């Protein structure tokens, strides 16, 4: 794997010795080049994995997430190029350094053949994010948001460390291959119940599960644009990836320990979808949409059937790309408007037609329109849950209808209607924003042609 | 839409509005022209029989059962003109009205076409630039202390003066811009 | 009731300015300027570049690629009646048993 | 090419209530003692080519005569040709 990790590390000296007016160009070019290198990992085989060495291994679950992580960084740089114009060279270089460190930690996390190394990098991914949120944030609530994001995650993930070291003491190894091959059933006991809770809660808090999602709207609203996309696209998938990796040792306890979380997610999807309808903010609406989709992913993972896992992976990738696009569009609107309110600027389609087209495409993809991978993952999870129980279809259909409703409400309120009269600084959209939207959307419509690349190991 | 409203409607205004609404809904009920004329004349007759009443308590006592009778027979699907706030084409062209200030963001290559229009545009902009400075002072000196009491704006009084707050009323896009 | 003198004067001046602005919206003969720069027959070419070429491409794709794999194109077997002859075998299907025919 | 021909409005004295069913309205208003000031304003709806109206049944059989003639001709031709 080192052919990927080493260039990401070399991105730091490359950035720090660049000229004052050429950091963005170099960072973007070499990030894109790195993404091309990461494409080779996608060719997985039906057998075990691509066991590179004793420390790193790649599966067909890690490959799509790794490619998405490597692809996101150029988009983050193009998004951050706007509001960092009046920033000193040292602070811009520090921002790029934080982004590069985040990418490096995520890359090392997603392979992480050993569970303790996975946990170490999984918590290491928390420092650059907190620095980005609390330093380059506009509102005065970024401090409280950073505190919430830190503590909600750390409180859940601290018992996970104890559970992992206990498992190593009893089992004798935490390597995922040995863990998978030597797995033994968990007896129904209070100690095993608490081991299950410790191993699960750390990933359920980050997903997030309904009832522990309070940190997500704050972190997404107060963060800068790049922090928002990296939170919505990749950082939410860490919990689901960890849960799908670690549910291999919790059987057969899960068969009855999944009921509270299944009920919480299947009701919180409806609750957050309804919340999206009555929202005065755009970024908050998108954050709640992300919560709903991640609740569906939680249900899929807890069902634990092959179709559930395939749909979960597809929905992970699709939601990451869609949420990143939606946050990009909201940021472009906010930069001209400087208000971040849904009804303050209206009828923008008459003034910016191409951005209206991008809004329509993003809303349609979020609406789970066929044959996009959004609906592929959605439908796989729906069929798996229907096999689990015939009554889930009611909740899932209600969620689908409310999702369509709030997506088209978001489109209509900001694009259709009569323009607001007292706003006269809606300049024509730059080439940077159009290119950003195109690079967000084209991979989705391209992946809809080859779904097997994002359907996970149980394909 | 043009005229500023008053704090309240007099009894005469209420009577006139009720008369207009009643005639409109009667026309909606009576599809044909001769029937409409006959029943409109009958309604006018029954409307003017209390024209010369003097006391206001009884007049206010009337125009209440009149409103109740109107509400009972209001033809729940009245006729609405296509451009009315209930018509079939009410806000049909509101998506074609592009504001004037958008022309300030045009590329110079786009401004190369239509040069005379943009020259007249610069002349209008200069006119507005001077007129605003005059109007702010005129309105400041004309308004009574404590803030305006009604939203009626005064006309221009001097020779070179222009009416206060005219730019966004004069430069409306069009009725049918496209 | 009716217009107050101030209202009449303001409306008159606003109308004058509005008419001036509207008249200024007109385009002169040379107002639109375009800079020029370059780098049966209609239906005859249309049927060639829009109908014939798709037929060729799709026929090639179906004949030599889709039908290469088994069971891709499956046709309902034609109806066989009494009295017809089969091309592949040449055998003749026996007729009916001469049901009684009145009216 | 648009509709620019300087159309001229007709004379206002042409429109009269005479020959229209507005007489019945005027007469029944005069019986109870009133008049319709706007009677002439709509006389144009009953004056020109709009004067003659067609009943619903007559509207349905718009081309009955020509169709019947063609049908009779065709039936006769078929009769005289098949009888051979």
């Amino acid at each position: 794997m080192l052919k990927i990790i080493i260039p990401t590390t070399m991105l730091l000296p490359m950035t720090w010795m660049s000229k004052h007016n050429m950091i963005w160009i170099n960072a973007t070019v070499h990030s894109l080049l790195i993404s091309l290198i990461s494409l080779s990992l996608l060719n997985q085989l039906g057998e075990n994995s691509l066991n590179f060495s004793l420390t790193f291994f790649s599966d067909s679950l890690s490959a799509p997430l790794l490619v998405l992580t490597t692809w996101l960084l150029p988009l983050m740089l193009m998004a951050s190029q706007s509001h960092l114009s009046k920033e000193t060279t040292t602070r811009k270089k520090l921002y790029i350094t934080m982004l590069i460190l985040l990418q490096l930690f995520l890359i090392m996390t997603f392979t992480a053949t050993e569970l303790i190394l996975f946990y170490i990098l999984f918590e290491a991914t928390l420092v650059p994010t907190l620095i980005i949120i609390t330093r380059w944030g506009n509102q005065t609530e970024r401090l409280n948001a950073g505190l919430y994001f830190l503590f909600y995650t750390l409180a859940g993930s601290l018992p996970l460390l104890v559970a992992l070291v206990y498992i190593q003491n009893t089992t004798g190894s935490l390597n995922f291959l040995i863990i998978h091959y030597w797995s033994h059933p968990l007896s129904n006991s209070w100690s095993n119940i608490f081991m299950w809770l410790a191993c699960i809660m750390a990933f359920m808090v980050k997903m997030p599960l309904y009832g522990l999602h309070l940190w997500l709207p704050k972190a997404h609203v107060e963060a800068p644009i790049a922090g928002s996309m990296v939170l919505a696209a990749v950082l939410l998938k860490l919990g689901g990836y960890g849960m799908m990796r670690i549910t291999t040792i919790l059987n057969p306890l899960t068969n009855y320990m999944a009921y509270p979380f299944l009920m919480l997610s299947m009701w919180g999807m409806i609750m957050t979808s309804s919340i999206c309808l009555r929202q005065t903010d755009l970024k908050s609406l998108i954050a709640y949409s992300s919560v709903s989709h991640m609740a569906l992913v939680i249900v899929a993972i807890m069902i634990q059937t092959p179709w559930s896992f395939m749909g979960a992976t597809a929905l992970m990738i699709a939601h990451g790309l869609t949420s990143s696009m939606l946050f990009c569009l909201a940021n472009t609107n906010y930069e001209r408007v400087h208000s971040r309110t849904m009804i303050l600027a209206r009828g923008l389609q008459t003034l910016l037609p191409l951005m209206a087209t991008w809004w329509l495409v993003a809303s349609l993809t979020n609406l789970a329109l066929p044959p996009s991978i959004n609906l592929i993952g959605e439908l796989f999870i729906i069929t798996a849950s229907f096999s689990w129980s015939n009554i889930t279809i009611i909740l899932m259909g209600m969620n689908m209808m409310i999702t369509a409703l709030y997506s088209l409400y978001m489109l209509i309120t900001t694009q259709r209607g009569k323009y607001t009269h007292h706003i006269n600084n809606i300049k024509p959209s730059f080439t940077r924003e159009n290119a950003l939207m195109a690079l967000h959307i084209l991979p989705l419509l391209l992946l809809t042609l080859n779904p097997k690349m994002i359907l996970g190991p149980l394909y | 839409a043009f005229s500023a409203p008053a704090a309240y409607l007099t009894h005469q205004q209420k009577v006139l509005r009720l008369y207009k609404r009643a005639l409109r809904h009667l026309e909606s009920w009576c599809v044909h022209r001769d029937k409409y004329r006959y029943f409109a004349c009958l309604m006018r007759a029954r409307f003017d029989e209390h024209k010369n009443e003097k006391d206001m308590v009884k007049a206010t006592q009337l125009l209440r059962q009149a409103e109740e009778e109107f509400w009972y027979g209001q033809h729940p699907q009245p006729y609405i003109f296509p451009e009315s706030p209930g018509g079939t084409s009410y806000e049909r062209y509101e998506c074609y009205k592009v504001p004037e200030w958008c022309l300030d963001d045009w590329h110079p290559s786009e401004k190369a076409m239509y040069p005379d229009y943009f020259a007249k545009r610069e002349q209008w902009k200069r006119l507005r630039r001077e007129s605003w400075e005059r109007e702010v002072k005129q309105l400041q000196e004309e308004t009574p202390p404590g803030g305006p009491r009604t939203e009626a704006l005064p006309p221009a009084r001097k020779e070179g003066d222009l009416p206060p707050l005219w730019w966004h009323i004069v430069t409306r896009p069009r009725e049918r811009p496209m | 009731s009716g217009y107050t003198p101030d209202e009449k004067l303001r409306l008159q001046q606003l109308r004058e300015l509005r008419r001036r602005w509207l008249k200024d919206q007109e385009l002169s003969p040379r107002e639109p300027v375009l800079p020029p720069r370059r780098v049966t027959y209609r239906h005859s070419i249309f049927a060639v570049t829009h109908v014939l070429i798709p037929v060729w491409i799709i026929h090639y794709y179906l004949k030599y690629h889709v039908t290469a794999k088994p069971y891709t194109v499956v046709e309902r077997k034609p109806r066989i009646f009494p009295g017809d002859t089969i091309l592949e075998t040449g055998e003749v299907i026996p007729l009916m048993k001469e049901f009684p025919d009145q009216h | 090419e648009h509709g620019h021909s300087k159309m001229e409005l007709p004379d206002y004295k042409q429109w009269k209530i005479e020959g229209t069913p507005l007489e019945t309205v005027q007469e029944k208003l005069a019986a109870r003692g009133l008049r319709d000031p706007w009677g002439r304003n709509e006389a144009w709806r009953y004056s020109g080519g709009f004067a003659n109206n067609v009943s619903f049944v007559g509207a349905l059989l718009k081309g009955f005569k020509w169709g019947f003639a063609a049908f009779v001709v065709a039936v006769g031709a078929e009769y005289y040709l098949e009888s051979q």
Partner: peptide, 14 residues
């Protein structure tokens, strides 16, 4: 008829 008007529209060049 020579009554061509100017159609105000946003900059479609970009």
């Amino acid at each position: 008829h020579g009554k061509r008007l100017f159609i105000i529209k946003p900059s479609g060049f970009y």
